[PDB]
Amino acid sequence: IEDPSWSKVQVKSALVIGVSDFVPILSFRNEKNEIVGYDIDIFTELCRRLGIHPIFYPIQWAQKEILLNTGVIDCIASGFSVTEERKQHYRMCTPYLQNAKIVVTLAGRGYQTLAQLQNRTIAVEADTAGDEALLNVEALKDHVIIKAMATIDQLYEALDSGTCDAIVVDLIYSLDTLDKNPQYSIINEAISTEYYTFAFRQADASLVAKIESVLAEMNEDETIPNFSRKWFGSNLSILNVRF
Numbered sequence: 538i539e540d541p542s543w544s545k546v547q548v549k550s551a552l553v554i555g556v557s558d559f560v561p562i563l564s565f566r567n568e569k570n571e572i573v574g575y576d577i578d579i580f581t582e583l584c585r586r587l588g589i590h591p592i593f594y595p596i597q598w599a600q601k602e603i604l605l606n607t608g609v610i611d612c613i614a615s616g617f618s619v620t621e622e623r624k625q626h627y628r629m630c631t632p633y634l635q636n637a638k639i640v641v642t643l644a645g646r647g648y649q650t651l652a653q654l655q656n657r658t659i660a661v662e663a664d665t666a667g668d669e670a671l672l673n674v675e676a677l678k679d680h681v682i683i684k685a686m687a688t689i690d691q692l693y694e695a696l697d698s699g700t701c702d703a704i705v706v707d708l709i710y711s712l713d714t715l716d717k718n719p720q721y722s723i724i725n726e727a728i729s730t731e732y733y734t735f736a737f738r739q740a741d742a743s744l745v746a747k748i749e750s751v752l753a754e755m756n757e758d759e760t761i762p763n764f765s766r767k768w769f770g771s772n773l774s775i776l777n778v779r780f
């Protein structure tokens with residue numbers, strides 16, 4: 538019958554959740570240096586209901602596929618986007634948030650349209666398919682220099698520096714940042730529309746099915762909607778959407 542991926546997690550009585558521990562709202566360090574956030578609240582309660590211990594393991598984002606496939610982690614959170622390419626590399630659970638990639642500039646520069654990004658340098662977080670998102674904007678293919686950086690803070694530093702003229706960020710983890718830092722301008726047109734998921738090893742169907750069953754319970758009983766209201770100010774959960 539089932540593949541042993543759930544059994545393995547139940548026997549260890551633990552789920553190792555790989556995260557980037559600097560993603561605002563979703564998985565970041567609070568003043569006490571504890572990892573907190575929307576994704577953390579979800580997996581902490583999910584593992585509680587499953588009778589297993591959640592282990593939030595800080596990873597290097599660029600290594601996430603290797604760490605997962607070699608078993609260092611069991612799944613990947615921190616705002617993991619569904620892409621068509623990634624469907625060939627990961628088993629992804631039913632999406633839980635919508636997201637969009639947006640382009641941010643310095644506000645005092647008059648950037649209004651994506652077309653004004655031509656012949657510019659744009660910074661993206663490495664291994665986030667942000668380069669692919671930009672290369673899919675007609676105005677920008679073959680007319681942009683893309684700089685890949687290791688953290689989100691580095692993007693804003695380059696934007697403050699003049700090392701780049703714009704950056705790509707995800708709307709979801711930017712909702713507080715750009716509500717409050719209006720030294721920055723968002724180009725009206727987003728460059729992608731996406732879903733966030735939690736990524737698992739391809740073969741691990743029984744583990745993902747177990748996880749999805751509990752996520753559904755936690756969404757219907759308003760636990761996750763209320764986590765969303767806590768972190769975002771409204772209920773953004775889309776776990777009752779059927780894909």
Ligand SMILES: NC(=[NH2+])NCCC[C@H](N)C(=O)O
Nearest residue numbers: 557598615616617618664665
């Ligand atoms: N290092 C992070 N987790 N950054 C947050 C954005 C991640 C991006 N949506 C991705 O799937 O690659």
